[PDB]
Design a protein around this ligand. Structure first.
Ligand SMILES: NC(=O)c1ccc[n+]([C@@H]2O[C@H](COP(=O)([O-])OP(=O)(O)OC[C@H]3O[C@@H](n4cnc5c(N)ncnc54)[C@H](OP(=O)(O)O)[C@@H]3O)[C@@H](O)[C@H]2O)c1
Ligand SMILES: Cc1ccc(Cl)c(Nc2ccccc2C(=O)O)c1Cl
Length: 318
């Protein structure tokens, strides 16, 4: 149920997504994460950006309090947001997440997105024309500061998110590198299966962690409603009928069988319980190949909001 990371720690291969659209009230993240843990999730994904770490930590700590799990059974990821890329601000951001969580360490701390914005409590600062107030930070300098968080024991493992290949080689080839990224958390699903980036990550012992593995929240204005609905896919639905599963389950199983660690968000008790059944069955080689054909280079989360600056990850081929 776990993949060994390039730093020797273990990451459960199914992870619970906690991000939800802003309209969802904060209290739902607490109850959803508790259900997820009860249902069998041990890997929990959050971030400063999500504004739920107080609730997600309470949920985690509640299931420790009631004897469900031990701290060491839980793999909790946080992420450094773009307003704290500056080296001096990286540890303060990690310590703020920890005080919010009331946890002593995160199992994994990621650079969330490689484009920096102006420091300040505003996660998306903007000028009067509505344009983003970008910042100028050496991402290698950011990484050195993330590394010291591992030195200090505040983050068991460290990694990146939304990095392309050239950005991974920039970390990888940096002089004096102490710690490789253990993972690169990116959008990945049968409509955007990241085959090329996945093959690169493997080459460097970097785990690819798939987000929007189920086709994403589809929340406007982040995703176009005219994009195809992954979970309405004819092939996924046929494999669902054949296996007596669901299309979400097919989508999730596909990643596990190609060596991708897979996130899955849901605030619904029924589907939270359904999704941990990804371990109960398996796809054949021919079904895997059919799902491979579904690729349409369809990115749900383009994050145009942050395009323009060079660090914008999604302009390269991969
Ligand atoms: N840049 C980043 O690092 C980044 C970006 C995006 C996401 N993420 C992270 O990774 C997670 C990925 O999820 P996501 O939020 O993009 O969405 P997702 O996991 O791809 O899909 C979530 C959506 O699918 C629905 N769903 C869940 N289980 C289902 C099931 N069994 N059957 C049918 N529908 C189901 C959910 O509705 P219900 O809640 O009603 O079930 C919700 O509308 C996020 O929560 C977040 O932790 C990271
Ligand atoms: C503005 C901006 C820029 C980059 C990312 Cl990664 C995000 N993050 C998300 C955007 C939409 C939905 C979910 C997220 C997420 O990171 O989970 C945002 Cl809000």
């Amino acid at each position: 149920q776990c993949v060994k990371l390039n730093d020797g720690h273990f990451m459960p291969v199914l992870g619970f997504g906690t991000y939800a659209p802003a309209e969802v009230p904060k209290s739902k993240a607490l109850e959803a994460t508790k259900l997820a843990i009860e249902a069998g999730f041990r890997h929990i994904d959050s971030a400063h950006l999500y504004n739920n770490e107080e609730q997600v930590g309470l949920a985690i700590r509640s299931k420790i309090a009631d004897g469900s799990v031990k701290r060491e059974d839980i793999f909790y990821t946080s992420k450094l947001w773009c307003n704290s890329h500056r080296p001096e601000l990286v540890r303060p951001a990690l310590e703020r997440s920890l005080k919010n969580l009331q946890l002593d360490y995160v199992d994994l701390y990621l650079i969330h997105f490689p484009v920096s914005v102006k420091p300040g409590e505003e996660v998306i600062p903007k000028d009067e024309n509505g344009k983003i107030l970008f910042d100028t930070v050496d991402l290698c300098a950011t990484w050195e500061a993330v590394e010291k968080c591992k030195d200090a024991g505040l983050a068991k493992s460290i990694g990146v998110s939304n990095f392309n290949r050239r950005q991974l080689e920039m970390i990888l080839n940096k002089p004096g590198l102490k710690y490789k990224p253990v993972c690169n958390q990116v959008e990945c699903h049968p409509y955007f299966n990241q085959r090329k980036l996945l093959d690169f990550c493997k080459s460097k012992d970097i785990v690819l962690v798939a987000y929007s593995a189920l086709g994403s929240h589809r929340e406007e204005p982040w995703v176009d409603p005219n994009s195809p609905v992954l979970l309405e896919d004819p092939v996924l639905c046929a494999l669902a009928k054949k296996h007596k599963r669901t299309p979400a389950l097919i989508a999730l199983r596909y990643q596990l069988q190609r060596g991708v660690v897979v996130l899955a968000k849901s605030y619904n008790e029924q589907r939270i319980r359904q999704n941990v059944q990804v371990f109960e069955f398996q796809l054949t080689s021919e079904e895997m190949k059919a799902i491979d054909g579904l690729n349409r280079n369809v990115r749900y989360l383009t994050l145009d909001i942050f395009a323009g600056p060079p660090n914008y990850p999604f302009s390269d081929e991969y």
